[PDB]
Amino acid sequence: MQRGIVWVVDDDSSIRWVLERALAGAGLTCTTFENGNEVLAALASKTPDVLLSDIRMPGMDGLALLKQIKQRHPMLPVIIMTAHSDLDAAVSAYQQGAFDYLPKPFDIDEAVALVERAISHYQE
């Protein structure tokens, strides 16, 4: 309902700036690493309110990371974020139980509200 965890794994300072500039400014918990690999160590420990997996970056990938949140506990809200590459998953994801497609670059202005959009579904 108010504030929450925000994990964004991507390889780009351009998307990391606007992102951290939105959360840190909105009081939302800002979190970043680089590739799904890093997020893994954090995933096994806890689960964010919403993450934007990336399937098109020099870091690692989005399948290896999504395979955890999907297997470990797919009940959590997840959003697919990437470019034309691997965009085919944008469809299958929906049938699998995806939330939406927030490709980058994007406007954090809309993301800030989209972050809670899913969290609400699991209102405590």
Query: Which three-class secondary structure state does DSSP give residue 98?
Result: coil
User: How determined?
Assistant: NMR
Q: How far from the centroid of its chain's Cα atoms is residue 18's Cα? A: 14
Q: Which residues contact 29 (CB under 8 A, 6 or more apart)?
A: 3, 4, 5, 6, 23
Answer CATH for 1-124 from 3.20.20.70, 3.40.50.300, 3.40.50.2300, 3.30.1490.190: 3.40.50.2300
CA 1/CA 14 separation, integer angstroms = 28
Query: Which three-class secondary structure state does DSSP give residue 70?
Result: helix
CA 96/CA 18 separation, integer angstroms = 30
Q: Hey, what amino acid is at 3? A: R
